[PDB]
Structures are given as C-alpha cells and as structure tokens.
C-alpha cells in the first residue's frame, strides 16, 4: 500500500539468469522478479523468454502499487537483457528513459580463471 506514481526499474541480466527489481524514485525496492521467481529452474532461467516473463511479472506486481511511469536501468550483458527491456516497454508501464549502468572496473580485481 504505497501509490508510488512514477519510479524506476533495474534489469540485472547475466548469462545464467535475468532479474528485475522495481523501485521508488529514491531507489528503494517495491517488488522484484526473476526467471526462477517464475517456474524456471535450471539453465532455462537465463533464457530470454524467462526474461520476458520476469519483466512482465515485476511490472504487474508494480502496477498493483499503482505505478505509471518507470525509468529503466540496465546492468549486465546477458541473453535476453534486451527482451527484458522489450517486454518492459509493452508492459503497460510507460517507459520514460532507458540507460546502461553496467559496472566495469578500472582494473582492480583478479577475475576467476574462468574469466581470464
């Protein structure tokens, strides 16, 4: 019970899963969702379709809070990141602006052998 009017959405997409958090204009979460939040379990989570269903799920969950406008912020490069943004556009939430915040360092930390 909020009635948050407008707000913003974070799409954090990896190759293994896509997960979408929706928040107030101060960044505090309202609802979230993910591939596994819906039926998916294994590799299937990080599918683009799951990303769609996650985007949507989070969006409906958000409109229960009476959301209208949303600012999309994208992190990660993963399968169905853009499908998340796409479902999120047609989600009936009016998408105000999209942006890419994906973190990269200035070369701080040694990655895993998997990542060299």
Partner 1 sequence: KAKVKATLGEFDLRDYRNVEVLKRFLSETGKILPRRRTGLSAKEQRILAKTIKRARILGLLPFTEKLVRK
**Residue with smaller CB distance to partner 1, 59 or 85:** 85
**Least Å distance between CB 59 and RNA?**
14
**6 counts as binding RNA under rule CB under 7 A:** no
**Least Å distance between CB 81 and partner 1?**
10
Q: Which does 110 bind (CB under 5 to 8 A by kind): RNA, Mg ion, partner 1, none?
A: RNA
Residue 82 belongs to what H/E stretch?
A: helix 82-89
**Residue with smaller CB distance to partner 1, 24 or 71:** 71
**Residue with smaller CB distance to RNA, 12 or 81:** 12
Report which of 67, 81, 76 is spatially closest to residue 29, judged by C-alpha positions. 67
**C-alpha R_g of the chain:** 15
Report which of 71, 67, 91 is spatially closest to residue 2, judged by C-alpha positions. 67
State the chain's maximal CA–CA distance in angstroms. 47
Figure out which of the listed residues 60, 69, 75, 98 binds RNA, where binding follows CB under 7 A. 75
Residues 2 and 37: their CA atoms lie apart, in Å, by 23
Figure out which of the listed residues 3, 5, 7, 12 binds RNA, where binding follows CB under 7 A. 12
Residues 18 and 101: their CA atoms lie apart, in Å, by 15
**Least Å distance between CB 108 and RNA?**
3
């Amino acid at each position: 019970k909020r009635q948050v009017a407008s707000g913003r959405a974070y799409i954090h997409a990896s190759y293994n899963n896509t997960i979408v958090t929706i928040t107030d204009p101060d960044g505090n979460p309202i609802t979230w969702s993910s591939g596994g939040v819906i039926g998916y379990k294994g590799s299937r989570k990080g599918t683009p379709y799951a990303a769609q269903l996650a985007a949507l799920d989070a969006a409906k969950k958000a409109m229960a809070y009476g959301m209208q406008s949303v600012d999309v912020i994208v992190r990660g490069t993963g399968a169905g990141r853009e499908q998340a943004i796409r479902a999120l556009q047609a989600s009936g939430l009016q998408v105000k602006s999209i942006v890419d915040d994906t973190p990269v360092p200035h070369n701080g930390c040694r990655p895993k052998k998997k990542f060299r």
